[PDB]
Ligand SMILES: CC(C)=CCC/C(C)=C/CC/C(C)=C\CO[C@H](COP(=O)(O)O)C(=O)O
Ligand SMILES: CC(C)=CCC/C(C)=C/CC/C(C)=C\CO[C@H](COP(=O)(O)O)C(=O)O
Ligand SMILES: [Mg+2]
C-alpha cells in the first residue's frame with residue numbers, strides 16, 4: 001500500500017490533461033444528488049471526483065456508504081479533502097481512493113501546519129485494513145483573501161500577495177519537502193491568476209497545482225488553466241437546482 | 253495515550269534544566285560495561301540526559317534493548333536515542349528508551365531525510381512495542397556544517413552556507429512555524445560556528461532547545477557555545493579513549 005509514497009491516484013492526476021474538477025460537499029449534497037452528478041463528471045472527462053467540506057460530523061457512518069454510492073456511479077478516483085481535528089487527525093473511510101492531506105503552511109497553529117500528519121499516521125492503520133487504505137496526497141494548502149471562518153478553525157492567515165516573499169518560502173518548502181500537490185484556495189475572493197502562474201513556474205514538473213474558490217464560469221476555469229493550474233475546483237456553482245446547465249457552462 | 257510527538261517529560265526536562273555539556277555514547281562502538289561506568293559519572297555531573305547515538309548501526313533491536321536497560325539501571329537521567337532513519341523502516345526504536353530524537357534534515361536533497369522518515373516512523377507506530385511503553389519523540393531540525401561527504405552520501409545533506417544568513421533564516425522560519433521542539437547543529441569534520449549558534453538562539457522561540465555538537469574536545473569550547481546561546485553541547489569522541497575520565501573532567505570542569 002503506497003500510503004504517503006506516490007501511488008495510482010497521484011499518477012493519474014499527473015498524467016491526465018489539466019481541467020476542471022467538481023467538488024461535492026457530502027455534508028450538504030444528498031447522496032442521491034451526488035450519484036447523479038458523479039455520472040455526469042465521468043462523461044465530461046474530469047480526472048477525479050473530490051468529496052470535501054470544511055464542516056463534518058459522524059464522518060465514518062456518513063462517508064463510508066457515501067463513498068461507496070459515488071464509486072458505484074463513476075470509475076474516477078474518489079478523493080477526500082477535510083480538515084483534521086486534534087485527537088483524531090484527518091478523517092478517513094475505507095473505500096476512498098485517496099485522502100488529500102493539507103499542510104496549512106500559513107497557519108499560526110503548528111498542528112494545522114503539519115502535526116496533524118503525525119497524528120494521522122500514528123493512528124494508521126486503525127480500523128481499516130492496511131491493504132485497503134486510501135493513498136495520501138501530501139499537499140501544501142494555502143488560503144487567500146479575508147477568511148475568518150478558516151482562520152478561526154484552522155489558524156490560517158491570508159497569504160500576502162504584496163510581494164513574493166511569503167509565497168517563495170512556501171515554494172522552497174514545497175520543493176524541498178517533496179510535496180505532491182499545492183492547493184491554492186480562496187473562500188471569499190479569488191486566488192489571483194498571477195499567483196497561480198508564480199506557483200506553476202516555481203514548482204517541479206510532477207507537482208500538481210489545484211486552485212479553487214468561487215469558480216463559477218468556464219471563463220474562470222480557462223483563465224486559471226492558462227495561468228498554469230493543473231486542476232480548477234468548483235463546488236458551490238452546482239449546489240442549486242439548475243446544476244446541469246451550470247456544469248455544462250463551466251466544463252464547456 | 254503516549255505523548256509521542258507531543259511534548260512530554262523528556263522535553264520538559266531539557267527545557268528547564270541548566271544548560272551544559274551532554275555526553276553522547278555511541279552504543280555500537282562503546283562496550284556496555286564502559287557505557288555503564290560513564291553513565292554513573294554523568295549522573296554525578298548533573299547532565300540533563302544521556303544520548304546514545306551513532307551514524308552506523310546493525311541488529312538495532314537485539315543490541316539496543318539490553319544496552320538501554322543497562323544504561324537505565326545505572327543512571328536516572330533520561331536516555332535519548334539519536335540515529336538516522338532507513339527507508340522501509342523509518343527511525344530505529346527499542347522499548348526502554350525515554351525518547352527518540354527525530355532529525356528533520358532540512359538541508360538534505362532527499363525528501364525522505366528532510367521529513368518523510370517521520371511519516372514512515374509514525375505509520376509503523378506502535379509496531380512491536382506497547383503504546384504505553386513507547387518513547388517520547390523530540391521533533392528536531394537537524395543541520396550539518398562543514399565538508400562532510402559521509403553524511404552527504406548517506407543522508408543527502410549539503411553543508412549549510414554561512415556566506416549569508418539566507419539559508420539559516422529559511423530554516424528558522426520552518427523551525428518556528430512548524431513548532432519544532434529542538435534544533436541540532438552538527439559538524440562531523442569541523443566546528444559549527446559560534447556566530448551561527450548565536451543567530452539560531454536569537455531567532456528561535458524561548459522553549460525551543462538548541463543543541464550543538466561535533467568535535468567538542470575542551471571545556472573552552474563548551475563555554476563558548478553556551479555563551480553563544482546553545483542549551484546543550486554534545487560530545488562523543490573526546491571520551492572514546494582510555495583516559496576518558498580526565499577528558500570528561502576537562503570538558504565538564
Ligand atoms: C484551507 C484548505 C485549502 C484546506 C484545509 C482543509 C479544508 C478546509 C478542506 C475543505 C475543502 C476546501 C478547501 C474548501 C471548501 O470549498 C472549496 C470549493 O469552493 P467553492 O464552493 O467556492 O467552489 C473546495 O472544496 O475547494
Ligand atoms: C546529521 C544529523 C545531525 C542527524 C541525522 C542522524 C544521525 C547521523 C545521528 C548520529 C548522531 C550524530 C548527529 C553525529 C555523530 O556524533 C556526534 C558527536 O560528534 P563528536 O564525536 O565529534 O563529539 C553526535 O552524536 O552529536
Ligand atoms: Mg461544508
Ligand SMILES: [Mg+2]
Pocket residue numbers: 121122123124125374375376377378
Ligand atoms: Mg501508525
